[PDB]
Design a binder for this molecule. Structure first.
Ligand SMILES: [Mg+2]
Ligand SMILES: [Mg+2]
Ligand SMILES: [Mg+2]
Ligand SMILES: [Mg+2]
Ligand SMILES: [Mg+2]
Ligand SMILES: [Mg+2]
Ligand SMILES: [Mg+2]
Ligand SMILES: [Mg+2]
Ligand SMILES: [Mg+2]
Ligand SMILES: [Mg+2]
Ligand SMILES: [Mg+2]
Ligand SMILES: [Mg+2]
Ligand SMILES: [Mg+2]
Ligand SMILES: [Mg+2]
Ligand SMILES: [Mg+2]
Ligand SMILES: [Mg+2]
Ligand SMILES: [Mg+2]
Ligand SMILES: [Mg+2]
Ligand SMILES: [Mg+2]
Ligand SMILES: [Mg+2]
Ligand SMILES: [Mg+2]
Ligand SMILES: [Mg+2]
Ligand SMILES: [Mg+2]
Ligand SMILES: [Mg+2]
Ligand SMILES: [Mg+2]
Ligand SMILES: [Mg+2]
Ligand SMILES: [Mg+2]
Ligand SMILES: [Mg+2]
Ligand SMILES: [Mg+2]
Ligand SMILES: [Mg+2]
Ligand SMILES: [Mg+2]
Ligand SMILES: [Mg+2]
Ligand SMILES: [Mg+2]
Ligand SMILES: [Mg+2]
Ligand SMILES: [Mg+2]
Ligand SMILES: [Mg+2]
Ligand SMILES: [Mg+2]
Ligand SMILES: [Mg+2]
Ligand SMILES: [Mg+2]
Lengths: 77, 149
RNA sequence: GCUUGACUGCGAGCGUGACGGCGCGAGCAGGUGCGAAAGCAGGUCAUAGUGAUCCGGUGGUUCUGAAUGGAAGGGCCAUC
RNA sequence: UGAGCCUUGAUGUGUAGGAUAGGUGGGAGGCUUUGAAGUGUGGACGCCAGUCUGCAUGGAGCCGACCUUGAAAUACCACCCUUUAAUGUUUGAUGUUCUAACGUUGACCCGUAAUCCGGGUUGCGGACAGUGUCUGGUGGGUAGUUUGACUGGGGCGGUCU
RNA sequence: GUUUAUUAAAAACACAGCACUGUGCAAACACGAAAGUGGACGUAUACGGUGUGACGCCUGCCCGGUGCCGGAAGGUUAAUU
RNA sequence: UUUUGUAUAAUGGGUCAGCGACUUAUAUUCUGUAGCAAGGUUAACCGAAUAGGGGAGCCGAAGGGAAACCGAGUCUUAACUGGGCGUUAAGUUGCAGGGUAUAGACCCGAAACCCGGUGAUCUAGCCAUGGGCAGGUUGAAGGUUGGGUAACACUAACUGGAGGACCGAACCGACUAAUGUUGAAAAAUUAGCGGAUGACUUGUGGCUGGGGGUGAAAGGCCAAUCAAACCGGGAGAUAGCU
RNA sequence: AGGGUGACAGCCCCGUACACAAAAAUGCACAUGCUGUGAGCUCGAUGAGUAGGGCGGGACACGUGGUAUCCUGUCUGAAUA
RNA sequence: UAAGGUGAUAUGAACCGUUAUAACCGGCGAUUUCCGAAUGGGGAAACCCAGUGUGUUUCGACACACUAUCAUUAACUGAAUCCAUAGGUUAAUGAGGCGAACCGGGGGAACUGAAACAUCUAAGUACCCCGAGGAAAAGAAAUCAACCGAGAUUCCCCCAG
């Protein structure tokens, strides 16, 4: 599914509002990308389905910190 | 993205320098190949503590080397007995081991490596000047007494 | 010829409307023009020439102003 | 390569004149064998007067109150201007290349007696493509609707204050 | 040949043939928010869409309008700043 | 019943029996009635439980003005000779009733719109695997031989067995007529009719699903009424109509 | 209270008021045993891709309005009693 | 607890019992085919077919037990590729499915009302989906108030149409 493995960001629903204020149901999808992260501690690359926001979270916290959250959640990588 | 460099990287800086880099350069090249680390408040302290620890350890070594450099000039004349023939020509020579072991027994604990001779290895009876490398910049002189045995 | 009554606030009493409204009005107060004066003038001989409300704009204002002083916004008056 | 900055080099016909006087200051020796004068010539500027400068040659000098001139020595040095060139830096623009993100519906290895998938190797691409959010255009493909009343039936015509 | 099973079998639809047009393959196109699949285990003598309708003799003029294709100089023009 | 007007040849009712349509809740106002009265009444809750407690509130005894504010007055205007609204009419809480408001709001009735399911046992197209086509004709290409030609062409006889070929049963279809039309049959029967080796026909099983399918295209077909199936739900949709 | 009994029952029958009852299993309370968990005191520490912001939506009685507050799909991004 | 009993249509038959293993009532046990989550594999539910381990005064074939998937944990094992990691086997423990309403969350109509209709309404309703408990959710102030103060959440009556 279109779910960020880091933040949990998923498709949300809302409306397209026209100039005439006609509401039509829509979705806002997360900016998802499958990215290979180098994990020094495991001497292996880990491919995660992450939003650009989640990628910034990994830049701040570090991949080991983020992967530890995935283990605690039971979420495999 | 602020990062503190581990190695020497072109156009950026040197080891321990704090530079602003594009997130993708750090993420996909600099951090995986160990050329840099994120400039986090924990690591900025760890690298400033190492900068202060190296500055204090380099100032004390500059203080110990100058105490050694003033002890080398204090002796001013060291006597070395060597078997020399007629006209003053030595059968052997007075090398680095010979000069270094003469000053260690005199007081100043100088190494074989620290001794620096210009052209010869001392093959004549008389007086000669011997310069010393105590540190990369600190230099001090002594006069060697070539006494015939 | 001289001029700004094409005045501002009101209005006894009426007309005509299911209503929203629309009309006629002497007289009162303030200030004004014309006339020597009595007087006349609140547009045009009269009856067509028009668009409610909402929303919004502009100016004015002893009104209001979400702790309090302001301000925003709202009201009231004029107008688009 | 447009624009800001930085060391450092070019460039200046009031007249008395050794002569195309840069303002203001340190102000008695600098510039030299890390090799001047003087000659030969190349290049650039230009007010065809001459300045700056490359190379060769040559070899013991061009110089100061020395008198003019408001203001000084091309003996030398420091902030700069009239303007111009070029090395360093900043954010742009444009191009070339790179590999490491990312693509592979090329080949191979393993999981594995598997035309899926994953990991790995390798080749080809490559910051492009593609995707997310935002945005202009298009969009009967789909969707929801509107499309008036009077009227000798209705429609046409006409009408509506 | 096909068709309105149950009032229409026809001159209607289809047809071989013709033409225009798209499509270089992870094709265009189509079913799918996607993954996957059909096209096709095909590859421009192929595949899709559109029109015309064996064959014979043939198919003239018009690009103003509407649709499409190509163009980049100028004018106007979104988010953004 | 509906109408200007119905014996009306306008509507409705075969007859009987039973059932079948102005309700209910909460607001709100008015009338009647009762209590108390410049006051009236409590709500939730507590409870000793239809008592009693609880006055939080609500309505009323004050209005005028957009308001600040002033107040039996106030607003209007600089101010009214004035003018507008007010002051001189008792209210409030039950209970019953008349109206109204929100609700299905007197009962019954659409054609439809939306949502979630069930359906390709009928039929459309396709996929896999099987089966069927009596009898009679026509006689393509090719081949052999003879004639022919310089050689070919060409030509005759034979052989050969093509085709969405011909005639015609089964099988598939459905052009005409009569019958039938409360049928033997919710599409047939009888006499004739077209195709009948093909783009043929048929069995068994599979796949496509409702703004969807499938369609040699008729808006055809998708389980006996398809310009949007069927079932259940939103649901008592709405119905200025009968 | 009520029901039944050949018609309508306080006194016929079953009940009703009232008074009682569990070998066994179980609910809830306290008392208490055990395993695990930790009380009190002193000195610290004080939740960052967060708050805030731009864009698109949604939620607030409040429909973008002069619109505070909340959530966040996208791009960003603090201070530290 | 008992003088009567072997449930009903529903007799009859053969019987059981009367002072306490007749029956009847309640607590705890035993047994509980096959299908169904269905779980050894399959399947058109109540059927078809196995592997392994065990039993056979008959050790053929039948009977009996175990063998699904996933999650966590452990042991053994074990690639590409040296370590590692993936993968593989086994064991322990848990889950699964069903079912009223209420409850938290993910999605989310339209008819209708506006006397048409699009903003708005219907309505976060109907419905679909996930999850949970005896309740759920919420909850101990980056809350209000107004210069006086209150002191988490939930629910009721007012404020007030
Ligand atoms: Mg006068
Ligand atoms: Mg204030
Ligand atoms: Mg792009
Ligand atoms: Mg847009
Ligand atoms: Mg359009
Ligand atoms: Mg349409
Ligand atoms: Mg509608
Ligand atoms: Mg009409
Ligand atoms: Mg035919
Ligand atoms: Mg027909
Ligand atoms: Mg017919
Ligand atoms: Mg045609
Ligand atoms: Mg033509
Ligand atoms: Mg064009
Ligand atoms: Mg009539
Ligand atoms: Mg009559
Ligand atoms: Mg009649
Ligand atoms: Mg009748
Ligand atoms: Mg009253
Ligand atoms: Mg035939
Ligand atoms: Mg027949
Ligand atoms: Mg015939
Ligand atoms: Mg025939
Ligand atoms: Mg079939
Ligand atoms: Mg409804
Ligand atoms: Mg109805
Ligand atoms: Mg009797
Ligand atoms: Mg805190
Ligand atoms: Mg906040
Ligand atoms: Mg406004
Ligand atoms: Mg099974
Ligand atoms: Mg089984
Ligand atoms: Mg089997
Ligand atoms: Mg290995
Ligand atoms: Mg369950
Ligand atoms: Mg409507
Ligand atoms: Mg439970
Ligand atoms: Mg709870
Ligand atoms: Mg306080």
């Amino acid at each position: 599914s279109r779910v960020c493995q880091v933040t949990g960001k998923r498709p949300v629903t809302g409306n397209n509002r026209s100039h005439a204020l006609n509401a039509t149901k829509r979705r806002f999808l997360p900016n998802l990308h499958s990215h290979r992260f180098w994990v020094e501690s495991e001497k292996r690359f880990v491919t995660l389905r992450v939003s650009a926001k989640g990628m910034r979270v990994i830049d701040k916290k570090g991949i080991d910190t983020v992967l530890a959250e995935l283990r605690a959640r039971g979420e495999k990588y | 993205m602020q990062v503190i460099l581990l190695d020497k990287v072109a156009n950026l800086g040197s080891l321990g320098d704090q530079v602003n880099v594009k997130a993708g350069y750090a993420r996909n090249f600099l951090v995986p190949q160990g050329k840099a680390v994120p400039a986090t408040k924990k690591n900025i302290e760890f690298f400033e503590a190492r900068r202060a620890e190296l500055e204090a350890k380099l100032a004390e070594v500059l203080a110990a080397a100058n105490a050694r450099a003033e002890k080398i000039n204090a002796l001013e004349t060291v006597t070395i007995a060597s078997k020399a023939g007629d006209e003053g020509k030595l059968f052997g020579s007075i090398g680095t081991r010979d000069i270094a072991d003469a000053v260690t027994a005199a007081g100043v604990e100088v190494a074989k490596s620290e001794v620096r001779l210009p052209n010869g290895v001392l093959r004549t009876t008389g007086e000669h000047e011997v310069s010393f490398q105590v540190h990369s910049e600190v230099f001090a002189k002594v006069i060697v007494n070539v006494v015939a045995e």
